[model samples]
Target: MALVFVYGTLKRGQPNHRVLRDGAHGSAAFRARGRTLEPYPLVIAGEHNIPWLLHLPGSGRLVEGEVYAVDERMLRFLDDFQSCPALYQRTVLRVQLLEEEPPAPTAVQCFVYSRATFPPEWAQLPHHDSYDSEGPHGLRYNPR
Candidate 1:
């Protein structure tokens, strides 16, 4: 199984969470809540109203998200569904697992969505700690 960190629609109570909500045929299991070990620019931009996490670490917020233990089948589905290496890339990054004590957290390496579908100029857009589907960006997933 592989641990993937999801910060947007795939998170619980989020728009596109149905895919992973029940663990995807038991292949994807919820692991733990976590945050980026370092900061990255997370913003909601582009025409599709998608949440973006810049590849540039140590530049923005320590993103808030969760970890999932996804089996091979589930991961392949994620690569296809999320369009990895294209729309998104599964990069191994260090994150702080919040399941431990509040004083200190365990560091883990998990795949994250930090591909550059856009350009670096997007770094000039805006940054946020976490994503809200109905944020002030006047944007919404509009999955339909």
Candidate 2:
């Protein structure tokens, strides 16, 4: 069992959402609308038509998205989908839940793309401190 924070296509209503909708074992639960405690640049890269969470460490902006409670099977599926340790890697992150009382933050594991795969020129592209699936970027979520 794990909690994953997602800020891209895996969120509801986005492409590839069916992967989570159907669940790896046919039943999974998801929590929507959470923001990251760490500020990281969320940007859309070339050709992929998806947003990438950059490893900016402390200089970026807080990111918004969804979190899901997943079983081990679902966790494995996510790892394959994100290409863990390759194109993207999973790491623990602090997320502030929008719906919480007083909005206390919790830590969960999520995927963040490796800095090595990011093109230097991509920094010049439109960058966002947060990602909204229904907003201009149409970017999209997970549990650890």
Candidate 3:
């Protein structure tokens, strides 16, 4: 099994969240809320304003999301859902469990948009590492 960290549409109630529920191999999926151990700038990308995790060490703001324990088949399904290695790339990173007090960091895999894959306009935009609830899109992190 693999520990996967989801910070965007894959979070509970988000557009693509069904991919996790539907793609799991049998009953082998588990989930929990968490945050990044090291702050990575979660920026708005493309016309869709989709969230993209940028690797910026010491970004100061923790990006919140959910963690899932999934089997290999489910992992591949998630990779496909993200159009990984093409639109987005999978990165192994550390996450702090929100379910625990004095949260501890744990290694988990997550998808991120690389600089090479990002649009030119996106690169020019100011990187805000967390969800903007009152922003144009009413964007906010959805957790389980």
Candidate 4:
């Protein structure tokens, strides 16, 4: 039973959620104790870097997201899709529910997806300056 923090594209039906939407899970609003990745670009810097996790530029903002509990099988599947020794990497990060008033610090794990598999033009779009001030966040993408 591992608690995973999902910020983008994996809330419930974003693109990666199909992998574990039917698995044993208990989800709730959570916040990552870091800055939010504006425009949400998917890329990795290196292996040691959590490729699957968004790069926190450290702007001191509560990035809103969700936490899901997945079993070994589901976790493995997600890992496979996320990355491995030569692909996406795993990194433990701090996450708290978005509605978690006062925000209780917790070490929630997440697999960051990085790498230039999508190409240059394929990336960058609907660009935004900062995600910290994205405004009202609540089931913005999914309800569960």
Which candidate tops lDDT? 1
Candidate 3, after superposition: displacement of residue 100 in Å? 12
Q: Rate the local accuracy (lDDT) of all candidates.
A: 0.82, 0.67, 0.64, 0.43
Per-residue alpha-carbon lDDT of candidate 1 for residues 100-128, written as tens digits (9 for 90 to 100): 34655488899988866677688887788
When 1 and 4 are scored with lDDT, the better candidate is: 1
Ranking by TM-score: 1, 2, 3, 4
Candidate 1 residue runs with Cα over 4 Å from true position: 22-26, 100-105
* Residue-wise C-alpha lDDT for candidate 3, range 45-89, written one tens digit per residue: 655667777655566367787777777788777677677787777
Give the per-residue lDDT digits (tens) of candidate 2, residues 17-92.
7787664444457865788877777777755556778776664568777888777888777777778777777767
Between candidates 2 and 4, the one scoring higher on lDDT is: 2
Cα lDDT tens digits, model 4, 1-144, are 566656555654454456555544332233333333332443222322122233333422345456666566766776676655355445555543333698665444454333334334423332222221122322132223
TM-score for predicted model 2 compared with the true structure: 0.76
**In each prediction, how many residue pairs overlap at the backbone (N, C-alpha, C within less than 3 A)?**
0, 9, 0, 15
Clashing pairs for predicted structure model 3, backbone only: none
